[PDB]
Coordinates of C-alpha atoms in Angstrom, one line a residue:
Chain A
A523 CA 1.3 -11.7 23.0
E524 CA -1.5 -14.3 22.8
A525 CA -2.9 -13.7 26.3
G526 CA -2.3 -10.0 25.9
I527 CA -3.9 -10.0 22.4
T528 CA -7.1 -11.8 23.5
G529 CA -9.8 -9.2 24.4
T530 CA -11.6 -6.2 23.0
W531 CA -9.9 -3.6 20.8
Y532 CA -11.2 -0.2 19.6
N533 CA -9.8 2.0 16.8
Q534 CA -10.0 5.8 16.2
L535 CA -13.2 5.6 13.9
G536 CA -15.3 3.8 16.5
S537 CA -15.0 0.2 15.2
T538 CA -14.5 -2.7 17.7
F539 CA -13.3 -6.2 17.4
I540 CA -13.1 -9.0 20.0
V541 CA -10.4 -11.6 19.4
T542 CA -9.1 -14.8 21.0
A543 CA -5.4 -15.7 20.2
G544 CA -5.1 -19.5 20.3
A545 CA -2.1 -21.3 21.5
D546 CA -1.0 -22.3 18.0
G547 CA -1.1 -18.9 16.3
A548 CA -4.8 -18.6 15.5
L549 CA -6.9 -15.5 15.9
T550 CA -10.7 -15.9 15.7
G551 CA -13.4 -13.4 16.7
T552 CA -15.9 -10.7 15.4
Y553 CA -15.5 -7.2 14.1
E554 CA -18.3 -4.6 14.5
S555 CA -17.7 -1.7 12.2
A556 CA -18.4 2.1 12.4
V557 CA -17.8 3.0 8.8
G558 CA -18.3 1.5 5.4
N559 CA -21.0 -0.5 3.8
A560 CA -20.9 -2.5 7.0
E561 CA -23.7 -3.1 9.5
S562 CA -23.4 -5.2 12.6
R563 CA -20.9 -7.9 13.3
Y564 CA -18.8 -9.8 10.9
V565 CA -16.6 -12.9 11.4
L566 CA -12.8 -12.4 11.5
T567 CA -10.0 -14.9 11.2
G568 CA -6.2 -14.5 11.2
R569 CA -2.8 -15.6 12.5
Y570 CA -0.1 -14.2 14.7
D571 CA 3.7 -15.2 14.9
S572 CA 4.7 -15.8 18.5
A573 CA 8.4 -15.8 19.5
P574 CA 7.5 -13.3 19.0
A575 CA 11.4 -11.3 21.9
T576 CA 14.4 -10.3 24.0
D577 CA 14.5 -6.7 22.5
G578 CA 10.9 -5.6 23.2
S579 CA 9.7 -6.0 19.5
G580 CA 6.1 -6.3 18.5
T581 CA 4.4 -9.5 17.6
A582 CA 3.5 -9.7 13.9
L583 CA -0.2 -10.6 13.0
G584 CA -2.9 -10.2 10.5
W585 CA -6.6 -10.9 10.0
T586 CA -9.3 -10.8 7.4
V587 CA -13.0 -9.7 7.5
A588 CA -15.4 -10.4 4.4
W589 CA -18.2 -7.8 4.6
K590 CA -21.1 -10.2 4.5
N591 CA -23.4 -11.1 7.3
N592 CA -27.3 -11.6 7.5
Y593 CA -28.0 -7.9 7.0
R594 CA -25.5 -6.8 4.5
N595 CA -23.4 -8.1 1.6
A596 CA -20.9 -5.3 0.5
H597 CA -19.1 -7.7 -1.9
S598 CA -15.7 -6.7 -0.4
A599 CA -13.1 -7.9 2.1
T600 CA -10.5 -6.1 4.2
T601 CA -7.1 -7.5 5.5
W602 CA -5.2 -5.9 8.3
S603 CA -1.4 -6.5 8.7
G604 CA 0.6 -5.1 11.7
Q605 CA 2.0 -5.9 15.1
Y606 CA 0.9 -6.0 18.7
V607 CA 3.0 -4.1 21.3
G608 CA 2.0 -4.9 24.9
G609 CA 2.3 -3.1 28.3
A610 CA 0.6 -0.2 29.9
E611 CA -0.6 1.2 26.7
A612 CA -0.7 -1.9 24.5
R613 CA -1.7 -1.3 20.9
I614 CA -2.0 -3.0 17.6
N615 CA -0.7 -0.7 14.7
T616 CA -1.8 -1.8 11.3
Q617 CA -2.0 -1.0 7.6
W618 CA -5.1 -2.4 5.7
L619 CA -6.1 -3.3 2.2
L620 CA -9.9 -3.3 1.2
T621 CA -10.7 -5.0 -2.1
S622 CA -14.1 -4.8 -3.7
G623 CA -15.3 -7.4 -6.4
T624 CA -15.2 -5.5 -9.8
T625 CA -15.5 -6.3 -13.5
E626 CA -12.0 -6.7 -15.2
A627 CA -12.2 -3.2 -16.5
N628 CA -12.3 -1.7 -13.0
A629 CA -10.0 -3.9 -11.3
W630 CA -7.2 -1.3 -11.4
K631 CA -9.3 0.7 -9.0
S632 CA -10.5 -2.2 -6.8
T633 CA -8.2 -1.8 -3.7
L634 CA -8.1 1.0 -1.1
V635 CA -5.2 1.2 1.4
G636 CA -5.3 2.8 4.9
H637 CA -4.1 2.4 8.5
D638 CA -5.7 1.9 11.9
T639 CA -4.4 1.9 15.4
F640 CA -6.3 -0.2 18.0
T641 CA -6.2 0.3 21.8
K642 CA -7.8 -1.6 24.8
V643 CA -9.5 1.7 25.8
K644 CA -11.9 3.5 23.4
Chain B
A1449 CA -16.5 -18.8 -6.4
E1450 CA -16.1 -21.3 -3.4
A1451 CA -16.1 -24.5 -5.5
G1452 CA -13.9 -22.7 -8.1
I1453 CA -11.6 -21.3 -5.4
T1454 CA -11.0 -24.7 -3.7
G1455 CA -7.8 -26.3 -5.1
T1456 CA -4.1 -25.5 -5.7
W1457 CA -2.9 -22.1 -6.8
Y1458 CA 0.6 -21.1 -8.0
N1459 CA 2.1 -17.5 -8.3
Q1460 CA 4.9 -16.1 -10.5
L1461 CA 7.7 -16.6 -7.9
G1462 CA 7.1 -20.4 -7.4
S1463 CA 5.0 -20.4 -4.3
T1464 CA 1.9 -22.6 -3.9
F1465 CA -1.1 -22.7 -1.7
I1466 CA -3.9 -25.2 -1.4
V1467 CA -7.2 -23.9 -0.1
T1468 CA -10.7 -25.1 0.7
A1469 CA -13.5 -22.4 0.5
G1470 CA -16.1 -23.4 3.0
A1471 CA -19.8 -22.8 2.5
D1472 CA -20.0 -20.0 4.9
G1473 CA -17.1 -17.8 3.7
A1474 CA -14.2 -19.5 5.2
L1475 CA -10.9 -20.3 3.6
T1476 CA -8.4 -22.7 5.2
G1477 CA -5.3 -24.4 3.8
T1478 CA -1.5 -24.2 3.6
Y1479 CA 1.0 -22.0 1.8
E1480 CA 4.4 -23.4 0.7
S1481 CA 6.7 -20.5 -0.1
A1482 CA 9.5 -20.0 -2.7
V1483 CA 10.9 -16.7 -1.3
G1484 CA 11.5 -15.1 2.0
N1485 CA 12.7 -16.3 5.3
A1486 CA 10.2 -19.1 4.8
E1487 CA 10.8 -22.9 4.6
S1488 CA 8.1 -25.5 4.1
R1489 CA 4.4 -25.2 4.7
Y1490 CA 2.6 -22.7 6.8
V1491 CA -1.0 -22.6 7.8
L1492 CA -3.3 -20.0 6.1
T1493 CA -6.7 -18.8 7.1
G1494 CA -9.0 -16.2 5.5
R1495 CA -12.5 -15.3 4.2
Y1496 CA -14.3 -14.7 1.0
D1497 CA -17.5 -12.7 0.2
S1498 CA -19.9 -14.7 -2.0
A1499 CA -22.7 -13.0 -3.8
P1500 CA -20.4 -12.5 -5.0
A1501 CA -22.7 -11.5 -9.5
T1502 CA -24.8 -10.7 -12.6
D1503 CA -22.0 -8.5 -14.2
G1504 CA -19.1 -11.0 -14.2
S1505 CA -17.3 -9.2 -11.2
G1506 CA -14.7 -11.0 -9.1
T1507 CA -15.3 -12.4 -5.7
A1508 CA -13.5 -10.5 -3.0
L1509 CA -11.3 -12.4 -0.5
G1510 CA -8.3 -12.2 1.7
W1511 CA -6.1 -14.5 3.9
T1512 CA -3.2 -14.4 6.3
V1513 CA 0.0 -16.5 6.8
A1514 CA 2.2 -16.1 10.0
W1515 CA 5.7 -17.3 9.0
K1516 CA 6.2 -19.8 11.8
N1517 CA 6.2 -23.5 11.5
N1518 CA 8.5 -26.3 13.1
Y1519 CA 11.5 -25.3 11.0
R1520 CA 11.4 -21.6 11.0
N1521 CA 10.1 -18.6 12.9
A1522 CA 10.6 -15.4 10.8
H1523 CA 8.7 -13.2 13.2
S1524 CA 6.5 -11.8 10.5
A1525 CA 3.1 -12.3 8.8
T1526 CA 1.8 -11.5 5.4
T1527 CA -1.9 -10.7 4.4
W1528 CA -3.2 -10.9 0.8
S1529 CA -6.3 -8.9 -0.3
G1530 CA -7.8 -9.4 -3.8
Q1531 CA -10.5 -11.1 -5.9
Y1532 CA -11.1 -14.4 -7.6
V1533 CA -12.1 -14.3 -11.3
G1534 CA -13.2 -17.8 -12.6
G1535 CA -13.5 -19.4 -16.0
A1536 CA -11.0 -20.8 -18.5
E1537 CA -8.2 -18.8 -17.1
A1538 CA -9.3 -18.3 -13.6
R1539 CA -7.0 -16.2 -11.4
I1540 CA -6.7 -14.5 -8.0
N1541 CA -5.2 -11.0 -8.3
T1542 CA -3.9 -9.7 -5.0
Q1543 CA -1.9 -7.0 -3.3
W1544 CA -0.1 -8.0 0.0
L1545 CA 1.3 -6.5 3.1
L1546 CA 4.2 -8.2 5.0
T1547 CA 4.8 -6.9 8.6
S1548 CA 7.9 -7.9 10.6
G1549 CA 7.9 -7.5 14.5
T1550 CA 10.2 -4.5 15.2
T1551 CA 11.2 -2.3 18.2
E1552 CA 9.1 1.0 18.3
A1553 CA 12.0 2.9 16.7
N1554 CA 11.9 0.8 13.5
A1555 CA 8.2 0.4 13.3
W1556 CA 8.1 3.0 10.4
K1557 CA 9.9 0.5 8.3
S1558 CA 8.1 -2.7 9.4
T1559 CA 5.7 -3.2 6.4
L1560 CA 6.5 -4.2 2.8
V1561 CA 3.9 -4.0 0.1
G1562 CA 3.7 -6.0 -3.1
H1563 CA 1.4 -7.9 -5.5
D1564 CA 0.9 -11.5 -6.7
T1565 CA -1.2 -13.1 -9.3
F1566 CA -2.1 -16.8 -8.8
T1567 CA -3.2 -19.3 -11.5
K1568 CA -4.3 -23.0 -11.4
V1569 CA -1.5 -23.8 -13.8
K1570 CA 2.1 -23.1 -12.7
Chain C
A686 CA 20.0 5.2 -15.5
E687 CA 19.3 8.9 -16.6
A688 CA 20.2 8.4 -20.2
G689 CA 18.4 5.0 -20.2
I690 CA 15.4 6.5 -18.4
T691 CA 14.9 9.4 -20.8
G692 CA 12.3 8.5 -23.5
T693 CA 8.9 7.0 -23.9
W694 CA 7.4 4.4 -21.7
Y695 CA 4.2 2.4 -22.0
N696 CA 2.3 0.3 -19.4
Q697 CA -0.1 -2.7 -19.7
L698 CA -3.3 -0.5 -19.7
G699 CA -2.3 1.7 -22.6
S700 CA -1.0 4.7 -20.8
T701 CA 2.2 6.5 -22.0
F702 CA 4.6 8.9 -20.4
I703 CA 7.6 10.7 -21.9
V704 CA 10.3 11.7 -19.5
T705 CA 13.7 13.4 -19.4
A706 CA 16.1 12.5 -16.5
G707 CA 18.2 15.4 -15.7
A708 CA 21.8 15.2 -14.6
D709 CA 21.0 16.1 -11.1
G710 CA 18.2 13.7 -10.3
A711 CA 15.2 15.4 -11.8
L712 CA 12.5 13.8 -13.9
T713 CA 10.1 16.0 -15.9
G714 CA 7.7 15.1 -18.7
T715 CA 4.0 14.3 -19.5
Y716 CA 1.7 11.4 -18.9
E717 CA -1.1 10.6 -21.3
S718 CA -3.6 8.2 -19.6
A719 CA -5.7 5.3 -20.9
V720 CA -7.9 4.9 -17.8
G721 CA -9.5 7.0 -15.1
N722 CA -11.1 10.3 -15.0
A723 CA -8.2 11.4 -17.1
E724 CA -8.3 12.9 -20.7
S725 CA -5.2 14.0 -22.6
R726 CA -1.8 14.8 -21.2
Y727 CA -0.9 15.9 -17.7
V728 CA 2.4 17.2 -16.4
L729 CA 4.6 14.9 -14.4
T730 CA 7.5 15.7 -12.1
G731 CA 9.7 13.5 -10.0
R732 CA 13.2 12.4 -8.9
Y733 CA 15.6 9.5 -9.3
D734 CA 18.6 8.3 -7.1
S735 CA 21.7 7.7 -9.3
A736 CA 24.6 5.7 -7.9
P737 CA 22.5 4.1 -8.5
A738 CA 25.6 -0.1 -9.0
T739 CA 28.3 -2.8 -9.1
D740 CA 25.6 -5.6 -8.5
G741 CA 23.2 -4.9 -11.3
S742 CA 20.5 -3.3 -8.9
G743 CA 17.8 -1.0 -10.2
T744 CA 17.7 2.8 -9.9
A745 CA 15.1 4.0 -7.4
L746 CA 12.7 6.7 -8.6
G747 CA 9.3 8.2 -8.2
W748 CA 7.0 10.8 -9.8
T749 CA 3.7 12.5 -9.4
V750 CA 0.8 13.5 -11.7
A751 CA -2.1 15.8 -10.5
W752 CA -5.1 15.0 -12.8
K753 CA -5.9 18.4 -13.9
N754 CA -5.3 19.9 -17.4
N755 CA -7.4 22.2 -19.7
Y756 CA -10.0 19.6 -20.3
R757 CA -10.4 17.8 -17.0
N758 CA -10.1 18.3 -13.3
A759 CA -10.5 15.0 -11.5
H760 CA -9.5 16.4 -8.1
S761 CA -6.9 13.7 -7.5
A762 CA -3.2 12.9 -7.9
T763 CA -1.3 9.7 -8.3
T764 CA 2.4 9.0 -7.2
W765 CA 4.4 6.1 -8.6
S766 CA 7.4 4.6 -6.6
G767 CA 9.7 2.0 -8.1
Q768 CA 13.0 1.3 -9.9
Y769 CA 14.4 1.3 -13.4
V770 CA 16.2 -1.8 -14.6
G771 CA 18.1 -1.3 -17.9
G772 CA 19.3 -3.5 -20.7
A773 CA 17.7 -5.4 -23.6
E774 CA 14.3 -5.4 -21.9
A775 CA 14.6 -2.4 -19.7
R776 CA 11.6 -1.7 -17.5
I777 CA 10.3 0.4 -14.6
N778 CA 8.4 -1.6 -12.0
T779 CA 6.2 0.5 -9.8
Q780 CA 3.5 0.5 -7.1
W781 CA 1.3 3.6 -7.1
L782 CA -1.0 5.5 -4.7
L783 CA -4.0 7.5 -6.1
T784 CA -5.6 10.0 -3.6
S785 CA -8.9 11.8 -4.3
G786 CA -9.8 15.1 -2.4
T787 CA -12.6 14.0 0.1
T788 CA -14.5 15.5 3.0
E789 CA -13.0 14.4 6.4
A790 CA -15.7 11.8 6.8
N791 CA -14.6 9.9 3.6
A792 CA -11.0 10.4 4.0
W793 CA -10.6 6.7 5.1
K794 CA -11.5 5.7 1.7
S795 CA -9.5 8.3 -0.3
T796 CA -6.5 6.3 -1.4
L797 CA -6.3 3.5 -4.0
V798 CA -3.2 1.3 -4.4
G799 CA -2.0 -0.6 -7.5
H800 CA 1.0 -1.5 -9.5
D801 CA 2.2 -0.8 -13.1
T802 CA 5.1 -2.1 -15.2
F803 CA 6.4 0.2 -18.0
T804 CA 8.4 -0.9 -21.0
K805 CA 10.0 0.9 -24.0
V806 CA 7.8 -1.2 -26.4
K807 CA 4.0 -1.1 -26.1
Chain D
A380 CA -4.8 25.4 -1.1
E381 CA -1.6 26.7 -2.8
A382 CA -1.2 29.8 -0.5
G383 CA -2.2 27.6 2.5
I384 CA 0.2 24.8 1.4
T385 CA 3.2 27.0 1.0
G386 CA 5.3 27.1 4.2
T387 CA 6.9 24.7 6.7
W388 CA 5.4 21.4 7.7
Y389 CA 6.4 18.9 10.5
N390 CA 5.4 15.2 10.9
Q391 CA 5.2 13.0 14.0
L392 CA 8.8 11.6 13.7
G393 CA 10.6 15.0 13.6
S394 CA 11.0 15.5 9.8
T395 CA 10.4 18.8 8.2
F396 CA 9.7 20.0 4.7
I397 CA 9.4 23.5 3.3
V398 CA 7.3 23.8 0.2
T399 CA 6.1 26.5 -2.3
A400 CA 2.9 25.7 -4.2
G401 CA 3.1 27.4 -7.6
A402 CA 0.1 28.9 -9.4
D403 CA 0.0 26.1 -11.9
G404 CA 0.0 23.0 -9.7
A405 CA 3.7 22.8 -8.9
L406 CA 5.2 22.0 -5.5
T407 CA 9.0 22.5 -5.0
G408 CA 11.1 22.6 -1.8
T409 CA 13.3 20.6 0.5
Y410 CA 12.8 17.8 3.0
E411 CA 15.0 17.5 6.1
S412 CA 14.6 14.0 7.6
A413 CA 14.6 12.6 11.1
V414 CA 14.7 8.9 10.3
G415 CA 16.2 6.6 7.7
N416 CA 19.5 6.5 5.9
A417 CA 19.0 10.2 5.4
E418 CA 21.2 13.1 6.6
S419 CA 20.5 16.7 5.9
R420 CA 18.2 18.2 3.3
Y421 CA 17.0 16.6 0.1
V422 CA 15.2 18.2 -2.9
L423 CA 11.5 17.5 -3.2
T424 CA 9.3 18.0 -6.3
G425 CA 5.5 17.3 -6.7
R426 CA 2.1 18.5 -7.9
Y427 CA -1.3 19.4 -6.4
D428 CA -4.8 19.5 -8.0
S429 CA -6.5 22.8 -7.3
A430 CA -10.3 23.1 -7.7
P431 CA -9.7 21.7 -5.5
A432 CA -14.3 22.8 -3.4
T433 CA -17.9 23.8 -2.3
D434 CA -18.1 20.8 0.2
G435 CA -14.9 21.4 2.3
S436 CA -12.9 18.5 0.6
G437 CA -9.2 18.3 0.8
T438 CA -6.8 19.2 -2.1
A439 CA -5.1 16.1 -3.5
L440 CA -1.3 16.3 -3.9
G441 CA 1.8 14.2 -4.0
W442 CA 5.6 14.7 -4.0
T443 CA 8.9 12.7 -4.3
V444 CA 12.2 12.8 -2.5
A445 CA 15.3 10.7 -3.9
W446 CA 17.6 10.2 -0.9
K447 CA 20.8 11.5 -2.4
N448 CA 22.5 14.7 -1.5
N449 CA 26.2 15.7 -0.9
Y450 CA 26.5 13.7 2.2
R451 CA 24.5 10.6 1.6
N452 CA 23.3 8.3 -1.2
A453 CA 20.8 5.8 0.2
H454 CA 19.9 4.4 -3.3
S455 CA 16.2 4.9 -2.6
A456 CA 13.3 7.3 -3.1
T457 CA 10.1 7.9 -1.3
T458 CA 6.7 9.3 -2.7
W459 CA 3.9 10.7 -0.5
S460 CA 0.3 10.8 -1.8
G461 CA -2.5 12.5 0.2
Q462 CA -4.5 15.7 0.6
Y463 CA -4.3 19.1 2.3
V464 CA -7.1 20.2 4.6
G465 CA -6.8 23.9 5.6
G466 CA -8.1 26.0 8.5
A467 CA -7.2 26.4 12.2
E468 CA -5.6 23.1 12.3
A469 CA -4.6 22.5 8.7
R470 CA -2.9 19.3 7.9
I471 CA -1.6 17.1 5.1
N472 CA -2.5 13.4 5.6
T473 CA -0.5 11.0 3.5
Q474 CA 0.4 7.4 2.8
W475 CA 3.9 6.9 1.4
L476 CA 5.9 4.3 -0.6
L477 CA 9.7 4.0 -0.2
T478 CA 11.5 1.9 -2.9
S479 CA 15.1 0.8 -2.6
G480 CA 17.2 -0.2 -5.7
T481 CA 17.6 -4.0 -5.5
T482 CA 18.8 -6.9 -7.7
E483 CA 15.9 -8.6 -9.5
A484 CA 15.9 -11.4 -7.0
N485 CA 15.0 -9.0 -4.1
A486 CA 12.7 -6.8 -5.9
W487 CA 9.7 -8.4 -4.2
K488 CA 10.9 -6.9 -1.0
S489 CA 12.0 -3.5 -2.4
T490 CA 9.0 -1.3 -1.3
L491 CA 7.9 -0.2 2.2
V492 CA 4.6 1.4 2.9
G493 CA 3.6 3.8 5.7
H494 CA 1.7 6.9 6.6
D495 CA 2.5 10.4 7.9
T496 CA 0.5 13.4 9.1
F497 CA 2.1 16.8 8.7
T498 CA 1.1 19.9 10.7
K499 CA 2.2 23.6 10.7
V500 CA 3.1 23.3 14.4
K501 CA 5.7 20.7 15.4

């Protein structure tokens, strides 16, 4: 985990994120998107639970990206929840939630759900 | 947002979290749980998208908590995605994803989904 | 369960659904919405798992509604997953997934997630 | 849709389901699982929204399976929400919710979320 999490990751839709896993469970870095009302790099922050593992289990982690930078303000934020699996073909499997700021009347339709798999190879 | 987000929040199950919304979209603080394989305070980190809003919309935000501290290591992490609505009865409505580290065979059943509403009053 | 599930249910946003729980796990009925690109009644079909329960547990169930009737065709369908809890203040607590038909390029943003609580009283 | 939906489908974990799409939006069939506290075939029921589509969009659909048959009673039900895409390599992409019957104290952890992709080839 940590050492193996640090680095560049790519998902199936062409997005990339670079992260540094800090000794005490922190994750900091940037996310560069491929889809959405995104454009350029956005700051990402999150945490991971190291014990993590005498039965080859994954390391649980999560992070958040608010879609605002100096070129765009999409009034939304996405959170990814999943686990890191290391080795030859290390990967981070996640499920995500994207919430948009809405009026109270449209709040029932404010959150989208999806999944993404990230690899060290693109 | 920001100023109105900073402070203590409580949800329906008795959990509490104290957060500080930083000028440039950061959210940092601690979460003290009521349920789970949690015990005491855990560090939380996240982001919010300020524009946020000439049509009284909510401010989108999200944060992560890895369930590890000096008393417990639950090998899991939870991410909350939602929006802040201010005013008299300000609230943060969220949907969350809790992922546990599993072996590859049980990864299909590694993530729980739920929702939580936080208020300034408990 | 079954007998206690049969009847009319109302949720917080003003929607209503009438269902009949059949002896062998079937659920059939109609859903009349309050929000969405819905208008009138739609057919609903689903299943419930009866054992259900010497430790007052809920009865797991789920159903689907395709948003097409003789007045509207929203090209979408919603599925509700949850459990029935009987008694004085019986309720059905659910989480739902609403998927819209999209082109392959927008499929990442095709599903919304939410929750609804239904009661016998409106 | 309909005609193209009728038939046998397989997902990545080895499960199979046979479905018949009825002229008026109904879906009926059986699901034979590969994972879970499942064993054999279970009845499935659902709906699809036909318009469906002059811009090659998918057909939205959903179905439910209660995990009870003459050999097992797992006290749970799963709902799948997604869309059908036809052609050479037709597929049904879905997100699912699996709810277990729990006591009120564990209801916060009663629902698992995941995704599955089904193809006509296994």
